[model samples]
Each structure stands twice: as structure tokens, then as C-alpha cells.
Target chain A: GRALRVLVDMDGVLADVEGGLLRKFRARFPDQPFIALEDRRGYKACEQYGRLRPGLSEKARSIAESKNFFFELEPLPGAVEAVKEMASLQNTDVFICTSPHKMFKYCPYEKYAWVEKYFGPDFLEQIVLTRDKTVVSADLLIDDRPDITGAEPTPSWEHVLFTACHNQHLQLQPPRRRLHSWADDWKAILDSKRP
Target chain B: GRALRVLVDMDGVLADVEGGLLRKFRARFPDQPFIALEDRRGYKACEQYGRLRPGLSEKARSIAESKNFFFELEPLPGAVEAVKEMASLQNTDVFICTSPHKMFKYCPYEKYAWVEKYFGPDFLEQIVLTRDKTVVSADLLIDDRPDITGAEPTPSWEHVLFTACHNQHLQLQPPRRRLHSWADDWKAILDSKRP
Candidate 1:
């Protein structure tokens, strides 16, 4: 038997970008009350923040565009270990499938550096930066977003949502898979289905 | 055994963009002497054209930027049959790995449409539009260009040169591979070395 290709998301699933962004958004706008992670209403926190503040869109953009935005992010709990385990699994090819920040010029390099620092330098080739993820042909995709940033209406592979505070509010339709945590031992579940 | 993933080139190998571009260039500059395919000096005809007529760079760019540039390309002789044979071969996964014209907004869609019309619609999932081909992990890569547009100094996979007028001059260093033409049954050659 051959290795199954597994595409893993970097932002919310492995790296804690959502949590970092929310914390930064709070610090940048002290006047606005701190929004709880659960209470955050939208997929893009900046858009929701703009709706609340009425004039902070550019400010939020500035914060995100800053070089440190991607570099300073911490890894999500158990993600490093889980990803290492996934890579170490006998018949699994693990790839970090992530999108480059559209507006930020420095995002790509910073994100690459961040991944190297956290995930290990050997994983540099495993990183795939694309706006539309549906173009990628893989057996499985684990992402935090319901719909990938620029994906087609119907993606080709099986999509498993990595539960996050922002996406937890909405219920994804049937047939879609969900991962509650990295500690859930997803490798076993995926290997069980192998021929 | 799993299929050996083969990344195939689109521009020079399958689609005759080089021929199309050369024809367009000759039309764009009637004053300049017609340069035969063998006499062509550079990888990009536009750059070679600019050497002949210094002021015509923007005009060449305009021609490339136009919506019809990618849409109107003709397929190379034996390419369709070769590609079809490559796709049908057992224990092999074929994908069209090509780059999009960065300056041209319509290049992506037009290229996709061109691929669909020429290669069939089923290959829509296998079409990967990327400037940096080195990011891909595959057993073999067949491309016309010596180094991928934005690829790293040392690429991950083994690269096989797709012979073209532009790259026929240089002698590639050791370990790299080269394929002469579609008329040569590459499938048999590849399959002979199967692990």
C-alpha cells in the first residue's frame, strides 16, 4: 500500500493565527471592549471589528500588514506534536496547505519563516502557498474554514473542519468531517480507513 | 505499487505557445528579419525581440497581456496523443504543471479554457498554475525551462528537460534528465525504471 496524501491547514489548525489576531485586535483598539473568542461573529475578525468600530478597517489592515503579524503567531496546542506524528506515520504524506495573505507583502516570507521555526526546517518543501486550495488534488484536507478562502463551490477531496471559535457557531452540512482537537488521534482514524 | 506521480509541462511540451508567440512576434515587428526556430536566441521570444527592436518591449507585453494570447495557442505535433497515452498508462499519475503569465489578468482562465478544449475537461483538476514549480513534490518533472521561473537553487524532485528551440543550446549538468520529443514513447522509458 502507498501513502495517503493529507493536506493540513496552517493558520487556525496548526498555527494559532486566529487567537493571535484577536489578541492584537484587542490591543490595537483599547476603546472597543475586548471581544471574547466565542463571541466573535465573523470569519474575518477585522471585518467584524470594522463593523463594530465603524472606522477601523484601515487600522486593522495596518496591523495585519505589519511584518510581525505572521512571524509572532504561536502554534496551536498539540498541533506541533500531532503534525510530527502525522509526518512520522508509516503510510501518510503530510503537506502544509496554507494561503498567503492577499494584502500583506511580507506575509509569504514571514509565514515560511514561522513554519520553519515551528514545524522544522526540513518541512520547507512541504509548504504550499495558494489562494485557491480546491486546485490541489489530495486524499484529505483538514482546514479550520468551512469554505477555503478561494476554493470552488464544490471541492474535489474530502474536507475535515478543524473546529475553531469562529466556525464553531455554524453547523457544517452532513458528510463533512470534523476534528475536535489534535489530541483526538486523527492518524488512527485516518489509517483505519486504509485498504 | 502506487502510481509514480509525473509532473508534465504544458507550454512547450503539450501546447505550442513558443510557435504561437514567435508567429505573433514576427507579425508585431514586420521590419525585423524573420528568425527561424533554430536561430531564436532566448527562452522568451519577447526578450529576444526586444534585443532586435529596443522600443517594442511594451508592445510585446501588450500582445501577451491581451486576453487572446493563451486562448489561441495550438498544440504541438503528437502532444495530444502522447499526453493521452501518458494519462492512460498504468501506475502513473500525470499532471499539467505550468505557470501563468503574471502580468496578464485573463491568462489563468484562458489557459484553463485552452487546457479543457485541447486536453479534455477531466484534466481541470490536474491543471496547476504556479510560477514556482519547485514547491511540488513529484517523482519526475518534465518542463521546457532550465530552471522554473521562481524556483529555488536546488529543487526537491528530479527534473527532465522538455526539448525546445530556446533551451536546446545549453548542456545540462549531471543527474538532471532530458526528453527529446513526444514522438519518442516516454511512457515505456519511464515504466522501465519503475520501482
Candidate 2:
């Protein structure tokens, strides 16, 4: 079996970020307004929260920026099994590629911790943290971000849209497929890419 | 000028890891046997520390494993200017690539925090943390590691050995060059490789 390099995004793709955010937001800022995942018009969570009320954007952003924000994210539905399955695929090398916030107080370490907790210590080697996804070489990059740009204008990996309420509006074409659900034929999608 | 991608290893290349390690090792385990950088035979700091006395290896490993061990590393001599100069070059993209420990309680976050402290907030985007350097696409990788292997057998970047007492024994070839010093003709070496 030949090598099929697949880069998976951490936050919206595997981690239940929106679900966790809504939970933390309500618990911490109980009096504040929050735009439900169904009500999200765009990708930026803070931006959506801003529209709901004045000066609430910073509070929304702060929830994620907190000490253990990333570490506490519950795994998305079927994402754990799906990722394990993807790794089990014939010659498929799955790397968790994530972009931690610039402040980076707890995010990067927590992302690694989160992965280790779900996937165990062996999969810890598969984590890759980079602000620029284009710098990483892979066959397919399954990320929730609609557009990914870095120092390299043209990347080695084809952008495969992942299931997320934030990125629901984007359209897909040939090179780019959608991982609409972890329960869906995601393995079959990866199987087709294997040369 | 075309793109000339350079991946710099944070620990030995930019940050004075050995110096910091020795500092922390002595402070934490004053009674235990410690190995200075000048007398080291190889890259594994723990292995070197182990040879000194009974159970000193675990003590040495624990020094690095302890929280804030990576966060407190002083910058290598002239590394800041050299990296800045590299970034200033026409069509050049310099990325700070480091392999964080598997017990990543504090390492990854601290690495980011260290970079931000020395290079400012903008340089934070230049970081790429992974155990596997092979997945990163670059023209050259300035690292102290004598060998780097991941899922990809053949990497895109050619390894340019960065100066370190631990990696002093490795020989270089045409594709693999030696970045012996930041104050040396390092920019000239990179300039020659530019398209």
C-alpha cells in the first residue's frame, strides 16, 4: 500500500467546538446572549455573538481564550471512531493539523492533551500545530475553514470541507469533497483518493 | 526571486536548550550527576546525563519533562538577527519547526509563548510544531537532529545541520550543508540555494 497523506483539522472538524463554546458561554456568561449553532450566519463565532449584543464579542472570544478552553472540548459525534478508522485505512497517514491562537496561553498544549486523551499517546505523534496549513504537504486537508491561506499561495493538499455549522454555506467541487458527517461514507471518500 | 522555504528547529537552532537544560538541571537536582554540553557524545541529553551516574538519566529527563523547562530557554547567539534576516530575504519563508515531547503538558504552549516573547507576535505565525518534520514542505531544514523520519520516507527539505555540541559528529554532503553558526555565512548558503 502506497502512502496517502491526509491532514485533519482539530477544532471544528474533530472537536465539538461549537457545542462546547455554547455550553461554556451559557455557564460563564449566563445573562449574555449567544447565537445558537443553527442561527450562525457565518464562520466567526465571536462575530456572530457580536451581532446578538454590544461588547459581547470579547466575552465570546474570551471563553475560548481561557486557560483550559481547548483542553475541555468534548469530541464531536463519531469523530473519534472516524479518525481511528482513517488511521487504520491502508497506508493512510492521518496528521491532526491545527492552528492555535496567537496568544497561545493554553491552546496548543491543550490540543495535544485533548488528542492524547481521545486517541492515546501513540497518536500524539500525529499532531501538527501550524498557523499556516499551506506549508504542510499532504494529499487531502480535511478542515472546516472555507479558505486557508499561508506563505505558500498554492498548497500541496486539496481542501476537503468538514462538517461544521460555521462552514455550512460553502459549495464544493471536484478536488474538494465534503466530510458531511463522521457517520457518513467518510472512509469511502478517503478510499477514492488513495492511488 | 522564487520561494526559498527554510525550517528552523527551535531548541538548538534558535533557543539555547542545552544551556537552559544545564541551568535547570543543576537548580533542580544539585546532588545528582550532570553532563555539560562540551563533554556530550550524542544528541539525547537524557542519555548523556544517564552515563554520568546512577539514575541520573531519569533525573535529566525529568528536568525537561518538568513544566516551564522549554518556556525559559534563552535565545541562541545571533539567532534572532539571523532568522529576521532570513525572513527579510526576497521570496523567503522561514518557519520555526520543533518536536514537542509526548507528555506535552506545557511544552507546546510554552514553545509558542517563548517565540512570541523573543520574536514578537508576528513571528508566532512562523511556528510549526510536530513530531514529524517530514510532512512539512520546505527547501531546507536547519535542525540539530542527525536524522528525521516520519510517514514520508523522502522529505521535501534537505537537512542543513545546525551547530550543537550533541550533533558535532555528523558528516554533511552536497544537498546537506552545515549551518555551523548564525554569525557565519548562513545567508550566503541560503542565497546559493535560492532559485
Candidate 3:
């Protein structure tokens, strides 16, 4: 009986959120020092941007605050196809579990639109929105964040790290499971975890 | 040692969702069979409407599908103030946990806007949106539904039924706690369970 509940993150795991943010930062403030995607190091882009130059932290964070930021994010390679295939697995339930920014003006609506656009209208119900991912019960959660914490001291789900430039520093110790690529690794890693 | 995580529902519990639907149903389809808020009996308004007249289920359901349906919903009497006060209790975390309609064209965005409108701008992060409520871990979940069921066979949260016309029939054989009114019952019922 493989009734595994798999929760997937939206921001960096599926959508190229930081990729969009970086491009917007460079376009909006060309005078400021630019940090390419490869150079990005921290989970929060604003933190990394703060190191680049003085008075750039809030400026870069404002990019996401602007209109249509989350709406226009492109899906990461093999994300849409891989998730759909994962849902096809028997006795498995997959949910697009995501946390909306506390600002929450445009991103919440756009998150729903982005899922419907990529996965079709029927997949809209599969989306779960919450600030604290720890409250959600699942067998595994695939996210790009290095650390996932919330109200619960012990969440039921196991966090599976999705490799990104921000979380690349965590590669040294292999205690946690990491998903490096979506093409082949998605099927290979996911199939083996089935109960 | 009462560390209670209270999950309060948004629609019928806090907001007068059926009241809004009743008004919209009467306004748009003036010639059709009308059901007042007091007369409504079923959990789904569409189903109740279908029973009264043929070819009315989809039409009645369309009221919610329309733009600004959820956003324009008025908060029930003392609902906003009660929930805010509940959040202030020690050792208790309150969340506006809700489920959106499967036809999620408008309800999702409106839900956020509605919360901000009634509870002020700061309470946006307290919202938790998911079709399956069972996935979320909580000590108690306050909702109008007679029964709460989801992907999990045994959810961590205890379902506390908020008294509503749709669910009034279950009053005789009661095993679940029912919140009758927001004015006094809210404070009495919530404070008693505080850990």
C-alpha cells in the first residue's frame, strides 16, 4: 500500500521565482551591483542583494512587491511534466503546497493562475496555500528552501531538498535527500520512495 | 499546558457566504424560484435550489463563480472581532483555514481580500487555503460543515461545527461541539478549550 502524500513547493522548486526576481532587479536598478543566478547564495535574495551594495536590499525586495511578479514566473525545466506523472502513480496523492509571502497582494492570485495555466483547470484543487508548511501532513515535501520551519515542533512530512543556487552550500553533508534535476532524477528518486 | 492550534473557517463561519449567495441568486434570476437565507437547508445551495426547480443547480452555483462573490461577502455578526480576540489568547494559534470552490476562478483572490478587509491588513498571513482540510494539523477546526473528511482517515484536528441553517439538522444527535453565536458563545467556547 503506497498511499504516499507528496507535497511540492511552488516558488523555486517549480517556478523560476528568484530567476525572475534577479532579472527584474537588474532591469529596474541598473546602477546597482548585479548578482547573477550563479552568484546567488542565500535562500532569501534580499539578503544576498544586501551584500552587493548599500541601499539595495529593500529595492530588490520591492521587485516581488510589484505587479505580476509571481504570475509571469516560468516553470522550471521538467516541473510540470514530472508533477503530472507523479500524480499518475497509484495510491499516491500529490499536492502543490506553497507558502505565500506575508505581503500577499498579487502572489496569492497569481499562484492559482500559474497552476491552472500549467497543469490545467482541474489541477487547481491540488494547490495548498499556507504560511506554515509544518502544519501540513504529508509523507514528503519537495522544496528549495534549506530549512523549513513552522508552528509545529515535529511536522509529519520529510523535507526533500530541491537543488538551487541559493541552497547549493548544503551539498557537503548528505544527510537529507536532494533532488538535483527533474528530467531523470524525478522518476528515479520518487519511485524508490513509494511505500 | 494547553497549546491549542485553532483553525477557524472563513466562509459560513466568519462570513455570511450563504446570505450573499441568496441575495445574488434572487437578484440575477428574478423570475426563478427563490430561497431566503432562513429557508436554506442544505450545505450546498445549488443542491437545495435544484430540488425546488429543474435546471437551477448550475445557475445557482454560478453566483459564487461570478466575480467579487467571495470578496463582497459580509462578515457575520461579531465574527471578525471574535476571531481577533481568540488569536490573542495565550498558548493558542488561530488560523483562517478555508477551502475554495473547485471552480476556483475568483474565490481564491477574494478570500485574501476579504480577510484583509475585515481583520485589517496585518492578519493576511494567518490564512490557510486548501481543498483538503485534513492535511493541516491543528487541535480544533471550526467550520459549518456537519462532517469534515479529507485525504487523511484520522486528521489531528477536532471538527467543531459552527451552527448554521445547513447543518442544524444534526443538532438532535450531537457528538461535536456547536458554536451557536459569535457574541458570547465564541468567548465561552474558545476559552474553555485553551490549553
**RMSD to native for every prediction?**
11.4, 1.7, 2.4
List DockQ for all candidates.
0.05, 0.90, 0.64
Q: Write the per-residue lDDT of candidate 1 for residues B95-165, one digit (tens) a residue.
A: 78776544324565576678778877666656655556754556678888886633234444578888899
Native-to-model Cα distance after best TM-score fit, residue A142 in candidate 2, in Å: 0.8
What TM-scores result for chain A when each predicted structure is judged separately against the true chain A? 0.91, 0.94, 0.94
| Number of the predicted model whose TM-score against the real structure is largest | 2
Q: Worst 10-residue stretch by lDDT in candidate 1 chain A? A: A148-157
Q: Whole-model Cα lDDT per candidate?
A: 0.72, 0.86, 0.84
- lDDT tens digits by residue: candidate 1, A67-173: 78888988988998898888887877677877655532456567667877887777766666555576555667888888763223444458888888888877778
Evaluated on chain B only, what are the TM-scores of all the candidate structures, in order? 0.90, 0.94, 0.93
User: What's the TM-score of each model vs. the native?
Assistant: 0.56, 0.95, 0.91
Best candidate, DockQ: 2
Error of 2 at A119 (Å): 0.8
Put down candidate 2 lDDT per residue, A1-195, tens digits, no spaces: 468999999888899889888989999999987888877766678888888898889998999899888889988889999999889877899999998865587888788889889999899999999989999999889998887888887898888888788778767656667888788787777777776
Real contacts recovered, all predictions: 0.00, 1.00, 0.69
Model 2 CAPRI quality: high
TM-score of 3: 0.91
For model 2 chain A, where is the 10-residue window of minimal lDDT? A167-176
